Symmetry: C2
Subunit: 30 residues, 2 copies
């Protein structure tokens, strides 16, 4: 339970992070 | 210890997300 829950939360956040870093990259260099 | 490691990574990532949104905000307004 706790481990599963936390890995789902981690996963979600890393998708958001990935997206945001790509958007930042775009804005700084284009 | 997988749980320990993941709680540290979660913490870090929430700070990184916050930081990046503030950088995006900054760049929109110069
Ligand atoms: Na568990
Ligand atoms: Na939990
Ligand atoms: Na642990
Ligand atoms: Na945490
Ligand atoms: Na806790």
């Amino acid at each position: 339970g706790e481990l599963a829950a936390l890995k789902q939360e981690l996963a979600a956040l890393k998708w958001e992070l990935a997206a945001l870093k790509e958007e930042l990259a775009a804005l700084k260099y284009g």
